[PDB]
Design a protein around this ligand. Structure first.
Ligand SMILES: COCCOCCOCCOc1ccc(C(C)(C)CC(C)(C)C)cc1
Ligand SMILES: COCCOCCOCCOc1ccc(C(C)(C)CC(C)(C)C)cc1
Ligand SMILES: COCCOCCOCCOc1ccc(C(C)(C)CC(C)(C)C)cc1
Ligand SMILES: COCCOCCOCCOc1ccc(C(C)(C)CC(C)(C)C)cc1
Lengths: 143, 143, 143, 143
């Protein structure tokens, strides 16, 4: 079916493509962050939050994709296709994964309205010209 | 992270290992059941329930895995690799997909208590040797 | 008929003639901004605002002009005339279009009074010669 | 963004398609009418009505297209290109322009409900076979 993984939260793919693809941190970095900050609540037997649920399912899915790609590469004999699997994964699905993880982690941490206003402001900013925008890229802080 | 996609909901992979592997319906049947009973909810912008929050993500994961295997079978001129990848997807991950779909659809339709009782009772019925096994296995029913 | 597209909103062309070309984001950027911030209200059957109405009509104009430029590229076998028409369209019409899109988005975003005070101040700043005006221009920003 | 210029007023492209392309008056005639009837308003500094706003924007776009056509006629020596461009502009873009002009002038003048009932009645007419199609095609009146 046609589902938007964010509209149950108050966002949309059209709104997260409003940021450059070179903005979203790497998958490994986001997973490390997620461990460090919410391992005890993702591994928890509680409906702690919809973000927790969705993040769990996403992590399991990335793990299964990784498993599959490693298996294909290990079985295949020639590199041309022993690589193309993991390569295409990190190309097309890595972006979706890290957009979604960024969303969920950032929300759980800072706030949903904050993350949304940040998306909007950062798009407006990265689209405005430098002479007439503030010079420092926007960023999220708990400090 | 070792996440159990069920302990959040009050279960485990073990409790679901009582059911054999050939017990679980086809992914087509289960996707049809979902599109029938819970579509307006899985497309809604609401946290209708953690079951929905999980089912949306799992369906997106399955779609992306399908796209992967298809792009593979297409761009890979080795039909052996095509077949192996796309059918191993089924072999290994479809069983998990349909376990999770079964669990969620059944805890939505009938309930958590009813489903866990069903799991216990079916485990009894199946661990029981045949000679003493009644032919009327437990079936989940609203009627 | 001597129509001023801002006289209805309390502004004028003479008040936006000071804003240079390097001030206005690209057409693509402004369109993405609108699509991300106001799509569910520009595609809506409500009279959400004069700015919404005007944005709708201007986007329709621009879409038809892009259709024209495509038809040109396809039906004009004179590369010179073809490229000259396309460049005229883009440069001139997109400059006017960026001007108007900016006015409307900025108003909807900040306020009519804020946008007009900002225009007055930017005019003061841009009339001042460089030897007596600060180097850092005024700035309209949510941040 | 896919936008319907009539959906905020209470109609739909699929509804004004009931009327043939050779039904709408000349752009000349429609502009004469709009001038004579609402010039003091389309030149006004007031959101007199959404129809007024939309008409302002449309007439501005038509004026820019006229300026384009003159620029072509003077610059481009290639007669085939010049004429093809002017003809495309007038024919197609003016078909759309006079659809819009007609809708807005007619609404402002007679009424939205009147215009929509007229659309459905004209559909009835044009659908009725010529053996039973009265020659008195429906027409909008204030009497
Ligand atoms: C080969 O099957 C063995 C059955 O035992 C399952 C053991 O693993 C636990 C399965 O749990 C899941 C369920 C779903 C999933 C996701 C959400 C990632 C969906 C999937 C598998 C379709 C990608 C991941 C793990
Ligand atoms: C190259 O990526 C472009 C961005 O795509 C935009 C998103 O398109 C709609 C679908 O979005 C998602 C988001 C996440 C996912 C899941 C949860 C399955 C995770 C993933 C991407 C790791 C497979 C699937 C689809
Ligand atoms: C070839 O003509 C097709 C007839 O129109 C079918 C309906 O198309 C819907 C779009 O309608 C309009 C109407 C007006 C316009 C504007 C106001 C932008 C004016 C125009 C046509 C001069 C560009 C754009 C689209
Ligand atoms: C070439 O641009 C120079 C700057 O403009 C100077 C005059 O400013 C007045 C702007 O007038 C318009 C006219 C039309 C428009 C719309 C939005 C209808 C778009 C267009 C140009 C595609 C017709 C916008 C502004």
């Amino acid at each position: 079916m046609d589902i938007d993984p964010y509209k149950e939260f108050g966002a949309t793919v059209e709104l997260l493509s409003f940021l450059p693809s070179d903005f979203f941190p790497s998958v490994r970095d986001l997973l490390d962050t997620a461990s460090a900050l919410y391992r005890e609540a993702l591994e928890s037997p509680e409906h702690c939050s919809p973000h927790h649920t969705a993040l769990r399912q996403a992590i399991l899915c990335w793990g299964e994709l990784m498993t599959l790609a490693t298996w294909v590469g290990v079985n295949l004999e020639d590199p041309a296709s022993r690589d193309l699997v993991v390569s295409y994964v990190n190309t097309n699905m890595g972006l979706k994964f890290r957009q979604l993880l960024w969303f969920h982690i950032s929300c759980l941490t800072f706030g949903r309205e904050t993350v949304i206003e940040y998306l909007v402001s950062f798009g407006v900013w990265i689209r405005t010209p430098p002479a007439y925008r503030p010079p420092n890229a926007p960023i999220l802080s708990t400090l």
